[PDB]
Symmetry: D2
Subunit: 257 residues, 4 copies
Amino acid sequence: MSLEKRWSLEGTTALVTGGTKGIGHAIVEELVGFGARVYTCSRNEAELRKCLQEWENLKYDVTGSVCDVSSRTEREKLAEEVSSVFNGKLNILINNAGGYVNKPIDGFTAEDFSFLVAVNLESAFHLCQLAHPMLKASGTGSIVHISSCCAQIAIPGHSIYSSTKGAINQLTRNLACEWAKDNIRTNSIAPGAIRTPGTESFVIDKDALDREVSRVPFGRIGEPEEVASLAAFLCMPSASYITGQVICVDGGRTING
Amino acid sequence: MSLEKRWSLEGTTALVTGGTKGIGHAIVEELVGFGARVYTCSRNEAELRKCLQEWENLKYDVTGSVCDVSSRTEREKLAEEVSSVFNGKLNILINNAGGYVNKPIDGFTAEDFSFLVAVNLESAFHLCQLAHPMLKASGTGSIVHISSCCAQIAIPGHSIYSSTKGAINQLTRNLACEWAKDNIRTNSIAPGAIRTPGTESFVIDKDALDREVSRVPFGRIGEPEEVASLAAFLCMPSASYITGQVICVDGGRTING
Amino acid sequence: MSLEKRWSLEGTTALVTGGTKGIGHAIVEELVGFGARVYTCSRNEAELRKCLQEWENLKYDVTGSVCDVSSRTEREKLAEEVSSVFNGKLNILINNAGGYVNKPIDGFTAEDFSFLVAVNLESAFHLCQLAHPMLKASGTGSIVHISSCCAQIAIPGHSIYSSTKGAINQLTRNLACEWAKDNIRTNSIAPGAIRTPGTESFVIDKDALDREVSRVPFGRIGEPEEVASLAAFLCMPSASYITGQVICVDGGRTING
Amino acid sequence: MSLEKRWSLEGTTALVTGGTKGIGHAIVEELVGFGARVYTCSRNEAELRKCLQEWENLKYDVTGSVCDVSSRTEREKLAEEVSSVFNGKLNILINNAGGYVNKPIDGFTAEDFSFLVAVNLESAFHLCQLAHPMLKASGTGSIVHISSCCAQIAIPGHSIYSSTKGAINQLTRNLACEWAKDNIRTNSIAPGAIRTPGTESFVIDKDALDREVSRVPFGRIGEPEEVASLAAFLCMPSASYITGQVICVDGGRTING
Ligand SMILES: NC(=O)c1ccc[n+]([C@@H]2O[C@H](COP(=O)([O-])OP(=O)(O)OC[C@H]3O[C@@H](n4cnc5c(N)ncnc54)[C@H](OP(=O)(O)O)[C@@H]3O)[C@@H](O)[C@H]2O)c1
Ligand SMILES: NC(=O)c1ccc[n+]([C@@H]2O[C@H](COP(=O)([O-])OP(=O)(O)OC[C@H]3O[C@@H](n4cnc5c(N)ncnc54)[C@H](OP(=O)(O)O)[C@@H]3O)[C@@H](O)[C@H]2O)c1
Ligand SMILES: NC(=O)c1ccc[n+]([C@@H]2O[C@H](COP(=O)([O-])OP(=O)(O)OC[C@H]3O[C@@H](n4cnc5c(N)ncnc54)[C@H](OP(=O)(O)O)[C@@H]3O)[C@@H](O)[C@H]2O)c1
Ligand SMILES: NC(=O)c1ccc[n+]([C@@H]2O[C@H](COP(=O)([O-])OP(=O)(O)OC[C@H]3O[C@@H](n4cnc5c(N)ncnc54)[C@H](OP(=O)(O)O)[C@@H]3O)[C@@H](O)[C@H]2O)c1
Ligand SMILES: O=Cc1ccc2c(c1)OCO2
Ligand SMILES: O=Cc1ccc2c(c1)OCO2
């Protein structure tokens, strides 16, 4: 295959969950930049519509619908609509929508636990199940989970969050092996702290920000496009022998003494 | 500290969940063998009572009550009874009770997912929360989770099982760091296939057994005491600088090419 | 930075050791395909000339000289010539040239050990030292080591080979943290078996080929461009927050049960 | 096998390199405490004699000779003498003697590199080869390498040191799989900073001490017996299903955020 085709997503179809802000928004734009047709969602109709209008103004081929991926019935309805829009063929599934709670282990409620498991683990698992027929039908499938680099280390307050992301890292391995025969690859990107609306209150908390940045060799938090570029690469034919991997995008955070 | 005291559990108190069969039964006996007073549980009153009678006949200091650790209210009642019996001081918590479903990713139901999360992950998490005061009050605490070596590799059918155990491996790291200041250590033992009542149908399935054993350098499945010995060691003062680790007891399975 | 610029190597200079065959040849072509000017080397003057003539006919900008990177004095001469050719500014260092011996542990000689350490570990370490000023001067330096996926698992015959690659994987982490202050990133690519006629490698005979085919979920060995693409990506501005990582390119080999 | 027998080293013979100070001295004492007969060595005849006299007064069975394990011919002479003393039957090989240099990457000399590879990697590899017949003859052989927790993270100054320990960690896996057929198990213990007056090590000065104290959740460096206990355990019948593992003994250092 030519270098040009190996580094392109021209003609492909993609579903990115949680695409109106932060990393997901950057992933939508990165995939469109390499020629993908993209479907996205969020929980907020007004914000999603504005995003879709902005993208249509820019001639970006993006469509979408409101979906709370923590709801089983909404996931079912999303997968049905995505299959209808893309005529049953999906090249790319990016499980980006997630959730976060920061508390000491002693403080987590049953509701905190169920919230994090549903949005970080069950959502991705069930969406993978639902998308398997159209990923297989595309003939070339790529699943990317957005995990977290803290699923390899212990950050104060992150116990249940990191545990659900560690579950995602293992699921990545099972998906990669079980669905290889369908020409579907599965990988996880594990970011460090990234500048997004989800981390705006963290950036305002200078004591917390400075402590985290002091552990990053690069001396700064990441930017959304520093995650999105790798997400696009992992979907390209260039990545055809990369499957089952968890790749940290963290400026050296996890390996820093 | 003397070698004798560093390799002893004399005077300690311990809670082992799921102690009537398999690995948990071997852990109860190993801890008692080093002088621990042990509390255990299972879901089956008749089998638990027979175990407790057998142990009393042998002069093993073991008590227990019926508890389904997948139930929030039963966990609360267990922790209250354990605290009452041990006068508020618990040296050792072994989270051994778990559950297992083997299906292709495509086949898992919502109920399979919720079953495995509740019994493998939420049970251990909540019991750790409930036991934290008495672990702290003991002055020297040790938590051991029984994970699985398949939380590092992809075994067909193990997707949700391995993912919940991978969550346990990460939780091990968070517990180890957050509660170090309370002199509590937390580690995980990750067995390969072990000969237990839980694997009896697997051993009858010679095609499945032979395939798994062909991947084990040692050419056999493990025995329960090969897990229980390490569980006892990790609770001894000898293990005072070991915390946050996931140790595979698998005959070389996970590292075998 | 625009998408086009983040995914470009225009204006960069690169040193790739061992570019005359196998993975290294594909890495040279991939870098030139994104606009890099490349310097390469090998021990075989005739093969090096033939490669350089072919790239000149293709209008690629590739330079080279004969160098045995297992020799300290030849590495010093190589680094001085590269610095002269590129006016003391080097964006990219790819340590690709390696050595391979396949024997049981009992069979390795002192010379096998010295051979493997010199070319797989010492050469990369010393070349990094020698290239540090040029890499620092570029302002966006990228070091890529080519390791092996077998630095995480045990493959028959691979003991010393895999051990030197495990050393490279750790060196990657030290380089990433010590030289982050110069905006030099260091990462390792760990291939599985790659189709490489003319190099002694992973696929030593039909038994090794059949073994790898059976253990890779995709049921095939990799192609050189499947490693080279990731090498190019890791050098692009798109990879600006990725450092200290060991990324397996092995079709799922190491994580497959 | 009874509990008492599974936790005993009665009737075993052991070779521990570098038993005159630091961790190795504690390992000798721990092995003798469980009934092992031990052979040890060092380069300092006066220190070796003083240690051997002290153990004789304590009625421990320890033998030794002067040996520089960085020398191929001296390793051959050591293995021949050990085989003579133990009549060709060795239960335990502990590769403890090491070397340590702390410099920035830019500062390492060719001699530093050769020094560290010879004692941390080549010595252990060649001693394993030389001891294989005696270990096989025992029927229950156990090899323990002493690695370092910094083979998983980047500590300032540790580049070549950590890299040689990363090589040891991989060699552990190859030995575990290749020699499982002889019932020889191989594992690595990876300590964090251990209080070791009289050896050049992790704690090079007050800045290193303060750093490690700040990064260890337990807020302290380790003690030699905290490594030695695990070394003894890994040699006991209790550890019969544990092989190919790298176990960190670091108070949580490597996994602490
Ligand atoms: N930022 C970091 O530092 C960081 C670090 C590591 C990992 N991550 C992971 O990166 C992923 C994205 O994080 P981010 O920081 O970019 O988050 P963010 O800025 O909060 O943006 C999240 C996006 O997802 C949508 N979303 C949230 N919950 C949803 C649900 N239940 N259903 C559908 N959409 C939902 C949000 O829109 P609505 O709220 O309108 O639905 C929004 O579009 C998450 O999985 C996160 O855990 C982030
Ligand atoms: N055996 C293996 O190959 C293997 C491998 C890797 C990991 N593991 C892990 O090892 C642990 C023990 O496994 P095992 O093979 O020894 O299992 P096992 O033979 O089935 O025995 C399980 C014990 O736990 C009790 N138990 C089960 N569910 C329970 C619940 N909800 N509440 C309280 N007790 C419960 C059982 O009694 P009742 O049913 O009467 O309650 C029994 O006493 C599990 O966490 C398992 O996932 C096992
Ligand atoms: N299946 C695989 O091929 C495989 C799998 C995993 C990892 N890897 C790793 O990937 C890298 C490339 O592997 P490869 O198989 O393509 O080839 P290789 O045999 O490692 O390297 C061959 C290239 O390097 C040159 N070379 C070798 N030794 C040299 C020396 N001392 N000085 C200068 N140049 C030298 C060769 O040319 P001359 O011989 O003419 O000098 C040739 O251009 C290596 O690090 C290898 O260990 C390969
Ligand atoms: N904080 C720590 O101390 C630390 C942390 C992590 C890992 N480790 C590892 O743990 C092991 C023990 O470390 P350590 O600090 O206690 O001591 P060390 O300096 O590695 O070893 C000292 C012992 O080995 C002997 N020795 C050294 N080089 C030798 C050679 N070439 N031939 C024969 N004997 C030799 C010494 O006696 P002579 O000098 O008299 O020969 C002494 O008995 C080493 O592998 C070390 O790398 C240590
Ligand atoms: O979502 C919030 C968040 C904050 C800090 C983090 C992080 C996520 O991952 C590594 O450090
Ligand atoms: O519980 C059942 C079970 C069966 C096979 C396994 C396993 C667990 O862990 C590694 O292989």
